Curated annotation (Swiss-Prot), chain A:
Cystine connections: none
Organism: Arabidopsis thaliana (Mouse-ear cress)
Protein name from the UniProt record: Tetrapyrrole-binding protein, chloroplastic
Sample GO molecular function, one term: enzyme binding
Main subcellular localisation: plastid
Subcellular location: Plastid, Chloroplast membrane
Gene designation per UniProt: GUN4
A single GO BP: positive regulation of catalytic activity
Gene Ontology, cellular component aspect: chloroplast; chloroplast membrane
C-alpha cells in the first residue's frame, strides 16, 4: 500500500474537491512528524521533502486531468509569467484583477478550466510556501 | 479512567493564552469543521450550506476566546463589524484587515503572513479564513445569528 492511495481514488472518480483536500493533508504528511503535529508546513521544510513524494502527487494530478492539473503545470505557468505570483493567480483563475475572489471556487474540469487551476494552495498564508513547492528539485525540467 | 473532562475548545484556549496565534488560527480552522457535523469532519471541509446548522453557542465560544486573548482586536465578531462598515464588500474588507494589497515589488499577498499581535496589527487580522476557496463560507460565518446585534 502507498500513502497516495486515497488521493488516487479521489482523482480516479474526478472528485477534485476531495482530491484537493487530500493533497493539502499529504503535503503536511510528507513534510515530517513536526508538520503533522502542528497541522501546517513551514516553508523551510519543503526543501526537505523528498522529490519522490512530490512527484507522486504531481504525477497523479497529471494522469487524471489530461495533464492540466498539478504542480508541474503550475510551475510552467509561473515561469511563463516571470514568477510574478499576482499574475500567476490571475492566469490560473484564483483571483481577478471589484470582486477579487468568487463566491465559490469552481472544482469541475471542463473546457473553460485553465491550466494549473488545481491543486489549490492557500496563498493567503503567504506565497513563500507555494514558491518553494514550484521551485523544488522534484519539478526541475 | 474518567469520562472526558476536556472540552473541544481547550486546545484553542491554551494556544491563545500562550499568544500562539498561528497555532490558534490552525486550530480555529479545525473547530469550524468539527462544530459543523460528522459529515464535514469526514470530508475535511465545510459546505457553506452547513454553516446555518452550526449552533450559536459554539461559534460564540470560539469568538469570545479570540476576543478575550487579543484585547478585542481578533475574532469573527470584530471582522463582522468591519465587514458591515464596508457594505459587505469583501475586497475592501480584505484590504482593511491586511490580507492583501491592491517596480517588480507589488505583492498582492505577502511572502509570509504576519501572525504577531503588536502595534501595527490591524483589527480583525485574525482568524484567517481561506477565501480562495470562495467568499461564501466566510459570508455565512460573519452573518451567522451568533454575531447578531
Amino acid at each position: 500500500a502507498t500513502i497516495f492511495d486515497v488521493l488516487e481514488n479521489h482523482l480516479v472518480n474526478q472528485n477534485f474537491r476531495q482530491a484537493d483536500e487530500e493533497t493539502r493533508r499529504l503535503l503536511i504528511q510528507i513534510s515530517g512528524e513536526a508538520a503533522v503535529k502542528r497541522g501546517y508546513v513551514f516553508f523551510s521544510e519543503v526543501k526537505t521533502i523528498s522529490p519522490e513524494d512530490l512527484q507522486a502527487i504531481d504525477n497523479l494530478w497529471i494522469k487524471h486531468s489530461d495533464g492540466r492539473f498539478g504542480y508541474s503545470v503550475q510551475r510552467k505557468i509561473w515561469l511563463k509569467v516571470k514568477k510574478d505570483f499576482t499574475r500567476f493567480f490571475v492566469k490560473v483563475e484564483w483571483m481577478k484583477l471589484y470582486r477579487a475572489f468568487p463566491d465559490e471556487f469552481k472544482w469541475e474540469l471542463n473546457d473553460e478550466t485553465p491550466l494549473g487551476h488545481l491543486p489549490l494552495t492557500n496563498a493567503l498564508r503567504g506565497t513563500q510556501l507555494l514558491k518553494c513547492v514550484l521551485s523544488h528539485p522534484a519539478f526541475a525540467t
